[PDB]
């Protein structure tokens, strides 16, 4: 899934 972090997508 995709996870919003600090202003940044990551898939996590």
């Known amino acids: ?3 919003w ?3 940044k997508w ?3």
């Open 1 to 3: 899934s995709w996870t």
């Open 5 to 7: 972090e600090n202003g």
């Open 10 to 12: 990551t898939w996590k």
